[PDB]
From a paper:
Herein, [name] DSM 70725 aromatic dioxygenase (MapADO) is characterized through X-ray crystallography, biophysical as well as biochemical assays, substrate docking and mutagenesis. MapADO features a seven-bladed β-propeller fold and a Fe2+ center coordinated by four histidine residues and shares a conserved structural motif with homologous enzymes despite low sequence identity (<38%). Similar proteins were termed aromatic dioxygenase (ADO), , apocarotenoid or alkene cleaving oxygenase (ACO). These enzymes primarily act on aromatic compounds with a hydroxy group in 4-position and use a mononuclear Fe2+ iron that is embraced by four histidines. O2 is activated by this nonheme iron and reacts with the C–C double bond of a substrate, eventually leading to C–C bond scission and two carbonyl species as the reaction products.
Acetate bound in product-free crystals formed hydrophobic interactions (L41, F340), indicating stable but nonspecific coordination. By analyzing the protein structure both in its native form and in complexes with vanillin 1, 4-hydroxybenzaldehyde (HBA, 3), and ortho-vanillin 5, we uncover the nuances of ligand binding and coordination within MapADO’s active site. MapADO features a seven-bladed β-propeller fold with an Fe2+ ion at the active site coordinated by H200, H251, H316, and H510. Fe2+ is coordinated to H200, H251, H316, and H510 and a water molecule. MapADO’s catalytic pocket lacks a conventional substrate access tunnel. Instead, it features a confined cavity closed by three Phe side chains, unlike other CCO structures with tunnels leading to the catalytic Fe.
Residue numbers in the entry: 24 to 548
Amino acid sequence: YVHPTDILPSGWPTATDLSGGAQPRRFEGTIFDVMTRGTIPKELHGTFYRIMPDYAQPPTYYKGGELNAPIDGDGTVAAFRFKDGKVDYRQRFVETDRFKVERRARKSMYGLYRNPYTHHPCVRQTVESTANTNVVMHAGRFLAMKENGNAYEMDPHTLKTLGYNPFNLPSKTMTAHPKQCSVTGNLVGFGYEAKGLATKDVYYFEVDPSGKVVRDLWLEAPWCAFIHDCALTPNYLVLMLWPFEANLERMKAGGHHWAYDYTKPITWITIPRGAKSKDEVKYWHWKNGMPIHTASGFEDEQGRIIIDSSLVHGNAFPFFPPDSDEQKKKQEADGTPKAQFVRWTIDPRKDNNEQLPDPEVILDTPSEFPQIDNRFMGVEYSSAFINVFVPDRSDGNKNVFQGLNGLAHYKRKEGTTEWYYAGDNCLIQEPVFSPRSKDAPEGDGFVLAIVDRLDLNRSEVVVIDTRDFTKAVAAVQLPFAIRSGIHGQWIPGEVTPDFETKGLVDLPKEEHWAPLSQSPYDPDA
Ligand SMILES: [Fe+2]
């Protein structure tokens, strides 16, 4: 049986998200008092903000959208606010300059990921960011980020877009993976391609809790590399270079911004915090592979930089293949690479020209989207909350972003790993952590994540108490599915302006519309 209306043509190209799912959602609005199952912990007082790529218009401008990437689509923020056991939800697109152009024209006007030579001529000199990868609340300001532009600011309650580049960074870009230092409170980050397309320039900065840039430095990467993420330590910001290179000639010819290169080693740039000269920066190298995200970093008792990350032993973004014929044939032959969670040691006393030691395998399972207890951000940390392919219950042949059906709570100090299974016919997305109280022990509290109930065409938020990581205490049940996203963050109400007085949904007025005389009821009858 085929439903006759299902053979009527659609004008939509296949617009995937990182999970591989391709259903456009695109709604903007609210649900007040979202249905829950179980008991919402009274200790949750804040908002889980998650951001997702969800092209608002069918992305047909270049090559009919055939080469759209899962990381391309217009950023939309979902907010789930927990207060006193009750949850509200709001979904809204970021009003990026790109989104505004395309909605006003009711037309796709942009081409390939990060390639202005494939956008419509009238928009080539716009900010092309879709602000779709991560969010942060810093200095009272709520930001949507994507690494090919500065951030867009949004109201944290209505999600209305307020402006661009709120911290007035001088670079053309800001990472979507800045880190909020637990010691200083600074937002510590960088922007690469910081002087425009295919530039090697990197701008490092720290923005203090009042919104002021208090430390910065201009430097360069060894090649124009895809510097997605970083790790913060007490004395360093360490940039993590993936083995992709940008080529302006390729982009002018209409090809992809990035191409994977098997000959590039994973490379790290150490930036001493508050450095005064680019001469203080050092480049360190291992071997080829793709460490997608850091959990965090710290310095050990001997001052050595320790960083945990995912590690895919090959290209986890196969939609940006190599440039050369020989390397393309290797990618196709290899298919899905081995994927693990690992630990790197960079000893600053060593000669940085010597190859780094091989990383230690921490989890021998495909692992991605790690987060930590941010009370330990930029210092020694132990807990990591990791999105995993659950051992013996997962499909190792899926790309790392497409088979994530569990969570792990890894504790370095104890050496233990606990496991949460999302369920049969379920995926689960990146976890976030909220401490049980401000002075709870590290990693004691609640873990939240979005679950795709694939057989039900719905999405839910699960809530897990770390005292039993294997069991959900509550589920927030939406009446529909949302896109599978990239990152999200738990943002405590304490740091959210006006959290005490403003909900995600504004209340209707108190006064009745109708006069007293219209009631059916008479107290005398
Ligand atoms: Fe990321």
